[PDB]
Design an enzyme around this catalytic site. Structure first.
Site, PDB file in Angstrom:
ATOM      1  N   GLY A 166       0.800  -1.205   0.000  1.00 33.18           N
ATOM      2  CA  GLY A 166       0.000   0.000   0.000  1.00 33.18           C
ATOM      3  C   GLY A 166       0.840   1.265   0.000  1.00 33.18           C
ATOM      4  CG  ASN A 219      -2.918   7.572  10.522  1.00 29.66           C
ATOM      5  OD1 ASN A 219      -1.749   7.347  10.829  1.00 29.66           O
ATOM      6  ND2 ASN A 219      -3.464   7.112   9.406  1.00 29.66           N
ATOM      7  CD  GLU A 248      14.518 -12.750  22.517  1.00 27.35           C
ATOM      8  OE1 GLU A 248      14.158 -11.958  23.413  1.00 27.35           O
ATOM      9  OE2 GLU A 248      15.708 -13.089  22.348  1.00 27.35           O
TER      10      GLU A 248
END
Ligand SMILES: COc1ccc(C[C@@H]2NC(=O)/C=C/C[C@@H]([C@H](C)[C@H]3O[C@@H]3c3ccccc3)OC(=O)[C@H](CC(C)C)OC(=O)C(C)(C)CNC2=O)cc1Cl
Ligand SMILES: Nc1nc2c(ncn2[C@@H]2O[C@H](COP(=O)(O)OP(=O)(O)OP(=O)(O)O)[C@@H](O)[C@H]2O)c(=O)[nH]1
Ligand SMILES: Nc1nc2c(ncn2[C@@H]2O[C@H](COP(=O)(O)OP(=O)(O)O)[C@@H](O)[C@H]2O)c(=O)[nH]1
Lengths: 428, 425
Positions: A10, A205, A250
């Site tokens: 994108g 956002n 991890e």
């Protein structure tokens, strides 16, 4: 001995990846043309940045990055404004955008280009001998960044089933949204990439815009630079000396207990205009208004915490900050060995963009914490999905590209199951 | 960049297209020789959608002017933009249809549709990629509406995976003296429902009302209507002509604004409308959603905005625009549907149209457009209950069940519009 292949899907993924690789070249001291002043004396790998950067025969430190988008404008922007840094063979462009449609990127437009991207992925993985997995950069709202991400996740789960794949998604926000069907795309790409993603750092956002408004409207460049700083300090431990969270296993084991609950939350204290004690910046990582997801963690229960400190922070006072945090009754952990704040400290200070948006600071902190407060965000997304499906709004744009009507009901059932499992974790 | 092929059918389409192309070439800094002379690099950006790059820095438009009379082509060539247009793309018939929809849909449109198909295929086979087709025509005329719907059917047959954007001008009795225009309008509305995905319902009744009330000009001269529709078309296409947050490049605009394959009738409007003046944000926003300002004969108080794409042009503060539009949306929450969240998309372009310091263009799929399709259908009812001029159309091979089918489809569209208006979240 270990490699990672970054994948950007994108326009948001491509721009975020370009900003992040610029910040990685800035932090590691790599020149923009590809050479290295100090660390090229050896000329070989395994110098703690070999998990990201590959060295060619000419000594150029080309990053192991795949830029895929169905619009060639951002790819040509990377190739023009960098060009010698990124090889043109690994930067895959597309002809027609999916245009805020999941089914267009998942069944018709992405299916004519998925084989070339898979071949480029295999070609880049042939140079890697001990590769750990892939970093998927995408966005939930778009058409390419949902449909092609879902098809790519399906293909990488079929073909690379012994590997673990991360996720770097962008949660849609009402402040800057270019589409109305972002709930539809987000729910469909959540249902499709639930079983194929193992760590999803979904950042909206709206929180970045609020941080830029109240600390620094700000444009997409300031949001891109701040998000690149956030992701760079998230993945600072993976490209540096080994304290904790230096591998994808991890990351998958320190934060993700369930096969489905793999949505961590990041929080950042030192956002100042271009000092501060350790206790206040540890306290600011627990502020609900400074999180990267617009949600309240006080109504939920924590599951894990991986505090990653950057800069010259003395490790003695971190435990005192931990004690002053734990004395407050706000944090309510789970009740099967919840452990605590697994602090690892990197002594290299983070580097900011010269004359950019964030000032250079000496004390930096990030809180990679899992919680059940993301269920509020998923409830908001399913409420927006349910409001636009009672009257079957915008349905025909997806069925006309090969998808079925029952896929929306299947994604609704999957999101109901995810909300029910979040509630069952949240209820003792 | 992608490529759009422009199609204009009829003398109304030719005149409004010529004025629109003049406004665009003034805005984009393109002279009559096709050479760039602007002062901004944004003008040369995204120029391949409309202007074909010829040899020696010649940016000629990819416009296909189609008509059935050569007088309109002579009027186009006699204007200033005549040498700017492509001479090979001129297609003109010998005899006009003259307000005959059947003659332009079954005989003369059929006899010239092979030539316009060859021209369209010649333009399309040179495309690196096809974005869509933009159609500008009038629903009342003879070759305009009929040849536009025949071209729409041929394009949908040849390229089923391409968008079809139509600037369909609905006829009105206050500016047009011809009586048979509800027949052409209802037949073209029935064709555009079944074979088109986008429609910009620009109504001449609302244009006459704007020129009468706002501009205080009693005479509805066609030059002023041409200038107003050209300004509104430039303000609509500033999303496609310039890069921004809301690109809305045809398919994106259809994904945002169109919830249903039948309910795709828009309602464009232009707030700072001035004939041939302080401008600020809240006055432009309160002029944006006014009933008088909109260019379709509708009442937005009686309908619900399904989708809104308000675009601002000029040098303005984006925060104040967002705050004013959020205040407008919250103050008038009964005027918007509550089952489509965040239906208002705002984009700001720094390049204003020439002659205006600031501009404010709105596109909307309001439910109030069904008043227009009730008005035109009820004028069609008063012309079909007495079979006025029915011998002309039925003598060309058109069945009389075709008018009943078109009336039933428009009544079904009105019923579905009212049914989806009555539903609440
Ligand atoms: C109820 O009583 C009335 C009240 C008012 C009026 C107004 C009266 N008639 C109409 O509008 C009738 C339109 C039907 C179409 C018919 C259906 C066309 O296919 C016919 C055709 C024409 C040419 C070539 C091939 C086929 O004719 C026209 O368009 C003609 C074109 C011709 C003159 C070039 O043009 C006009 O009519 C004028 C001359 C420009 C103006 N005419 C009027 O003001 C009439 C009546 Cl009867
Ligand atoms: N933070 C941030 N978000 C972006 C950026 N670019 C696009 N987005 C997000 O993308 C969402 C809309 O998706 P699109 O406009 O279709 O872009 P996309 O996700 O890349 O999808 P495609 O255009 O099909 O490639 C918005 O909600 C934005 O939040 C960016 O540069 N920064
Ligand atoms: N707004 C506007 N409408 C027009 C103009 N010229 C014609 N029309 C409309 O278009 C219709 C006539 O269509 P026309 O293009 O003449 O069809 P043709 O004669 O077959 O080519 C009439 O109902 C008018 O209302 C114009 O300059 N401006």
């Amino acid at each position: 001995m270990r490699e990672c292949i970054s994948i950007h899907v994108g326009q948001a993924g491509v721009q975020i990846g370009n900003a992040c690789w610029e910040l990685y070249c800035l932090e590691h001291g790599i020149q923009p043309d590809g050479q290295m002043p100090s660390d090229k004396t050896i000329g070989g790998g395994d110098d703690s940045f070999n998990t990201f950067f590959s060295e060619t025969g000419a000594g150029k430190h080309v990053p192991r990055a795949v830029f895929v988008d169905l619009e060639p404008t951002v790819i040509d922007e990377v190739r023009t404004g960098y060009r010698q840094l990124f090889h043109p063979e690994q930067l895959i462009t597309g002809k027609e955008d999916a245009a805020n449609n999941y089914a267009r990127g998942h069944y018709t437009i992405g299916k004519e280009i998925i084989d070339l991207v898979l071949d480029r992925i295999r070609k880049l993985a042939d140079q890697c001998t001990g590769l750990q997995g892939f970093l998927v950069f995408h966005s939930f709202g778009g058409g390419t960044g949902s449909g092609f991400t879902s098809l790519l996740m399906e293909r990488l789960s079929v073909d690379y089933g012994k590997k673990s794949k991360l996720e770097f998604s962008i949660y849609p926000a009402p402040q800057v949204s270019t589409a109305v069907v972002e709930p539809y795309n987000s729910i469909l790409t959540t249902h499709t990439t639930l079983e194929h993603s193992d760590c999803a750092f979904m950042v909206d956002n709206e929180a970045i815009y609020d941080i830029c408004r109240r600390n620094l409207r700000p444009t997409y460049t300031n949001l891109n630079r701040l998000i690149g700083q956030i992701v760079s300090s998230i993945t600072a431990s993976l490209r540096f000396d080994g304290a904790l969270n230096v591998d994808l296993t991890e990351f998958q084991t320190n934060l993700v207990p369930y096969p489905r609950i793999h949505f961590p939350l990041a929080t950042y204290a030192p956002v100042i205009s271009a000092q501060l004690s350790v206790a206040e910046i540890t306290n600011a990582c627990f502020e609900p208004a400074n999180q990267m997801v617009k949600c309240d963690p006080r109504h939920g229960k924590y599951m894990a915490c991986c505090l990653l400190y950057r800069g010259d922070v003395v490790p003695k006072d971190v435990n005192a900050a931990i004690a002053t945090i734990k004395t407050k009754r706000t944090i309510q952990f789970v009740d099967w060995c919840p452990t605590g704040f697994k602090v690892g400290i990197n002594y290299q200070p983070p580097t900011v963009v010269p004359g950019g948006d964030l000032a250079k600071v000496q004390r930096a902190v990030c809180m990679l914490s899992n919680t059940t407060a993301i269920a509020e965000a998923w409830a908001r997304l399913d409420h927006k999905f349910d409001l636009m499906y009672a009257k079957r709004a915008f349905v025909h744009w997806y069925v006309g590209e090969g998808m079925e009507e029952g896929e929306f009901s299947e994604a609704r059932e999957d999101m109901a199951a995810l909300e029910k499992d979040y509630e069952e974790v949240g209820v003792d | 960049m992608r490529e759009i092929v422009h199609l204009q059918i009829g003398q109304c389409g030719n005149q409004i297209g010529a004025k629109f192309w003049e406004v665009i070439s003034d805005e984009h800094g393109i002279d009559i020789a096709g050479n760039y002379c602007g002062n901004a690099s944004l003008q040369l950006e995204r120029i391949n959608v409309y202007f074909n790059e010829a040899y020696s820095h010649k940016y000629v438009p990819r416009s296909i002017l189609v008509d059935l009379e050569p007088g309109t082509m002579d009027s186009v060539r006699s204007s200033k933009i005549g040498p700017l247009f492509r001479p090979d793309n001129f297609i003109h018939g010998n005899s006009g249809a003259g307000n005959n929809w059947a003659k332009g849909h079954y005989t003369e449109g059929a006899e010239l549709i092979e030539n316009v198909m060859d021209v369209v295929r010649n333009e399309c086979e040179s495309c690196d990629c096809l974005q869509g087709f933009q159609l500008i025509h009038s629903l009342g005329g003879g070759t305009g509406s009929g040849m536009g719907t025949l071209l729409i059917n041929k394009i949908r047959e040849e390229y089923p995976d391409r968008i079809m954007n139509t600037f369909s001008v609905v006829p009105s009795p206050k500016v047009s003296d011809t009586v048979v225009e509800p027949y052409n309008a209802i037949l073209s509305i029935h064709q555009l429902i079944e074979n088109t995905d986008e429609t910009f319902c620009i109504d001449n009744e609302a244009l006459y009302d704007i020129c009468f009330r706002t501009l205080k000009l009693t005479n509805p001269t066609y030059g002023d209507l041409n200038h107003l529709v050209s300004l509104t078309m430039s303000g609509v296409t500033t999303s496609l002509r310039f890069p921004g947050q809301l690109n809305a490049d045809l398919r994106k605009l259809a994904v945002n604004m169109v919830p249903f394959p039948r309910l795709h009738f828009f309602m464009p409007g232009f707030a700072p409308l001035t004939a041939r003046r302080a401008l600020s944000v809240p006055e432009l926003t309160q002029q944006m959603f006014d009933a008088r300002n909109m260019m379709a004969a509708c009442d937005p108080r009686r309908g619900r905005y399904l989708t809104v794409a308000c675009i601002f042009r000029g040098r303005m503060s984006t925060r104040e625009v967002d705050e004013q539009l959020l205040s407008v949306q919250t103050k008038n929450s009964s005027y918007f549907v509550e089952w489509i969240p965040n239906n208002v998309k705002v984009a700001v372009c720094d390049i204003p149209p020439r002659g205006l310091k600031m501009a404010a263009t709105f596109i909307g799929n309001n439910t109030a457009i069904q008043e227009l399709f009730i008005r035109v259908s009820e004028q069609f009812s008063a012309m079909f209950r007495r079979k006025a001029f029915l011998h002309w159309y039925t003598g060309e091979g058109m069945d009389e069940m075709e008018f009943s089918e078109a009336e039933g489809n428009t009544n079904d569209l009105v019923s579905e519009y009212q049914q989806y208006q009555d539903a609440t979240a």
